[PDB]
Structures are given as structure tokens and as C-alpha cells.
Design a protein around this ligand. Structure first.
Ligand SMILES: Cc1cnn(C[C@H]2C[NH2+][C@H](C)CN2CC(=O)N2CC(C)(C)c3cnc(Cc4ccccc4)cc32)c1
Ligand code: NA
Ligand SMILES: [Zn+2]
Length: 106
């Protein structure tokens, strides 16, 4: 995998628009909602349920129905400027705390 983009400039500007991201999914069979994915910056690659964020370039796969796009975006790509713009560092910290705590109980 490539290093995550942490600048304020998106790595894939062709996918900066919500509607452009939506088109990439086509008929979507997966447990996670495509519009929810698009809203969280993600577009489909067309193999299984692999998605990439247009901004950080961050890739995710194998979506369980309990996995939220924004939460996962924060878990795995915490430097993403798009994430920070949309959700705020307050949200981002609670998510980190929550995940880093879930381990304790597990
Ligand atoms: C394989 C893998 C590792 N962890 N998980 C658990 C899942 C659970 N569902 C969640 C929705 C996401 N999880 C993490 C995940 O998806 N990560 C974590 C990471 C960053 C190490 C990683 C690397 N590379 C892939 C592959 C890839 C996907 C898009 C484009 C190109 C390659 C996935 C992935 C799956
Ligand atoms: Na498809
Ligand atoms: Zn991102």
C-alpha cells in the first residue's frame, strides 16, 4: 500500500464530487450502504467491496453490517483532511478513544 495522503489536496480530484463517487458502485450487493460510503469520501474499485477515499487515497474492504464508513475512515486513516473537514477533531478523538478502548474489553 502507498503512504496515506495527509495534505489538504485530494489525491484523486476526479472523485471529489459526490455524484462521481456514486457512479463507481453500480448495482451494490454489499451490507454497507453505497450513499453512506460516498458521503464518507469513498468510491468503489469494482472488486468485491473495496473502496478508496478520494482525498487520502485510503483503502478499505470486507464491510460487516456493524461497520460504519465514517468510523472506519477515522480508524484506519486518521490523517485524512477530508475526514477532518467533514467530521471535526472532536468526533475524531471520540472514535479513536472508543476503538482504542474496545481492545481493553476484547
Ligand atoms: C485486508 C484487511 C485488513 N484488515 N481488514 C479488516 C477490514 C474489516 N472491514 C473494515 C470496513 C475495514 N477493515 C480494514 C481494512 O480493510 N484494511 C486495513 C488496512 C489499512 C491494513 C488495509 C490494507 N489493505 C486492504 C486491502 C485493500 C482495500 C482497498 C484497496 C486496496 C487494498 C484493506 C485494509 C481487511
Ligand atoms: Na460494480
Ligand atoms: Zn480520506
Amino acid at each position: 500500500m502507498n503512504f496515506p495522503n495527509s495534505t489538504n489536496l485530494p489525491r484523486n480530484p476526479s472523485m471529489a464530487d459526490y455524484e462521481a463517487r456514486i457512479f463507481t458502485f453500480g448495482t451494490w450487493i454489499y451490507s454497507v450502504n453505497k450513499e453512506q460510503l460516498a458521503r464518507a469520501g469513498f468510491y468503489a474499485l469494482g472488486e468485491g467491496d473495496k473502496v478508496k477515499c478520494f482525498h487520502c487515497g485510503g483503502g478499505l474492504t470486507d464491510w460487516k453490517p456493524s461497520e460504519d464508513p465514517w468510523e472506519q475512515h477515522a480508524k484506519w486513516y486518521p490523517g485524512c483532511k477530508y475526514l477532518l473537514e467533514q467530521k471535526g477533531q472532536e468526533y475524531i478523538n471520540n472514535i479513536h478513544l472508543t476503538h482504542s478502548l474496545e481492545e481493553c474489553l476484547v
